[PDB]
Amino acid sequence: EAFFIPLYELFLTYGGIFRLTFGPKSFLIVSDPSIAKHILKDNAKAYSKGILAEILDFVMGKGLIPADGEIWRRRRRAIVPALHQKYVAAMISLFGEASDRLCQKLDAAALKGEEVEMESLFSRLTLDIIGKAVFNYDFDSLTNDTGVIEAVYTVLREAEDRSPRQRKVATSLKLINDTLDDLIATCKRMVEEEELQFHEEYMNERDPSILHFLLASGDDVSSKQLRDDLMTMLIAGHETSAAVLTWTFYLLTTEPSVVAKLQEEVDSVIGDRFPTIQDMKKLKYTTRVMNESLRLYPQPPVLIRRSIDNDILGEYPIKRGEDIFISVWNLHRSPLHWDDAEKFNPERWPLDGPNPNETNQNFSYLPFGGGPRKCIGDMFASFENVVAIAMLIRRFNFQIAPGAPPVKMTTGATIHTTEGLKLTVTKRTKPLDIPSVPI
Numbered sequence: 001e002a003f004f005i006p007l008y009e010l011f012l013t014y015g016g017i018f019r020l021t022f023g024p025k026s027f028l029i030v031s032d033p034s035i036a037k038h039i040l041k042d043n044a045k046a047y048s049k050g051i052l053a054e055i056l057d058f059v060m061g062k063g064l065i066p067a068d069g070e071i072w073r074r075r076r077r078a079i080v081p082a083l084h085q086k087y088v089a090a091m092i093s094l095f096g097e098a099s100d101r102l103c104q105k106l107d108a109a110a111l112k113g114e115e116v117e118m119e120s121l122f123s124r125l126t127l128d129i130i131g132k133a134v135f136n137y138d139f140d141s142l143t144n145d146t147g148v149i150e151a152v153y154t155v156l157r158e159a160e161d162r163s164p165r166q167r168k169v170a171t172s173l174k175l176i177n178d179t180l181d182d183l184i185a186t187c188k189r190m191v192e193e194e195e196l197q198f199h200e201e202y203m204n205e206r207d208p209s210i211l212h213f214l215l216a217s218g219d220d221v222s223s224k225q226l227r228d229d230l231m232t233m234l235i236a237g238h239e240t241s242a243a244v245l246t247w248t249f250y251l252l253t254t255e256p257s258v259v260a261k262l263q264e265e266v267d268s269v270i271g272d273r274f275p276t277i278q279d280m281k282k283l284k285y286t287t288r289v290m291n292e293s294l295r296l297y298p299q300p301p302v303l304i305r306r307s308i309d310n311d312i313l314g315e316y317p318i319k320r321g322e323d324i325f326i327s328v329w330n331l332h333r334s335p336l337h338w339d340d341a342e343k344f345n346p347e348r349w350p351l352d353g354p355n356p357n358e359t360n361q362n363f364s365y366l367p368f369g370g371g372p373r374k375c376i377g378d379m380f381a382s383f384e385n386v387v388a389i390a391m392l393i394r395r396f397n398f399q400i401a402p403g404a405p406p407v408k409m410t411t412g413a414t415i416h417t418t419e420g421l422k423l424t425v426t427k428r429t430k431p432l433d434i435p436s437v438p439i
């Protein structure tokens, strides 16, 4: 049962900052956007990632997420350049390819009248995408189970359990790290033999991965640090989007009028096409659907910090050493800052107006965090999810399956369901329809 739920009712009663105590230990729970902005942006230098490092160190090492200080600064500067406009445009092709692979599975299911458990399918889709995008590996988890795949999920579950088995985890970590080593070696040879001058918009068309960019850049790093950086991006970009897609499709089942409006846009703008970078700005309603899904189901629902200096939060002075949970769930669903906060309403932000972000929503909306530690994959993931949503909604009607297990939420790094999202899937286009390509 999700720990952030009781925090919502406590926020309603006790306000935007309170101290949650468990005997001799306590946590400050922050649900006020002004206080959130102070911690995440205005006075970020007074904060570390705190217990987040303790939870994640065993798998991410000194990757970007749990890092602080000079290690953080140096690696952020090295990695962000890889996610340039040319790279993101190339990844859109990957997003379409992988989404189409999922569509093929859904199509087979639909023809047989089989119900599908979409959370697991989305988890596989997003794993396949992130492995290829980050380090040029094809997990093909949409198609098969492998030892490497099982290792990733094992390490995942263990990370969240900290949010026999110890040996299983150790073995899984070894297998992933050994796989990353092989990939790094292969990429090194490829860079050695290639004939491309490195620059700000560098990418090898045959291997557009972030790993390849890092190696071609002349990245001054240890093998340990590189593996940790890769592992970190793998975790960061996998279950996050898996949950975004899962919750988006859950939400679509709750509002047929939204589905109708989404179908109208997809049919009109892309039809059967793989989306391109140009379609990203035209898929306005699809983007709003995603925006609204992230508002209702943030990933993660809580951001973690610890004070390393004195500060003032709201009216309250604090010392160093305070463990702080910023409740993104509360910020996103705050009755004071959102009209009909529990309603799934993609048009709560004007369709043709600017896309919502932490700046224009003044820290009441933080889908990708904020300030210096904001997600580096915000554009990547926003586009990834728009592609997957659009291609699936073009091809299929989805409904909650009769007798499906109830949809409920769990604790964890991301908001998982308790038992999956079991849906019926039916085709919207005919097998013998000619592919339709709108321009």
Ligand code: HEM
Pocket: 064, 065, 076, 232, 233, 236, 237, 238, 240, 241, 244, 299, 300, 303, 304, 366, 367, 368, 369, 370, 372, 373, 374, 375, 376, 377, 378, 380, 381, 382
């Ligand atoms: C829907 C998908 C995603 C969501 C909702 C998401 C969300 C977030 C959030 C909220 C943070 C800030 C955490 C904090 O401040 O403590 C973050 C950090 C980060 N994310 Fe994402 N993310 C997504 C996908 C990705 C992808 C695709 C990548 C890489 C390609 C990525 C890489 C990272 C990294 C490296 C950080 C740490 C940045 C730093 O500390 O310098 N994430 N993410």
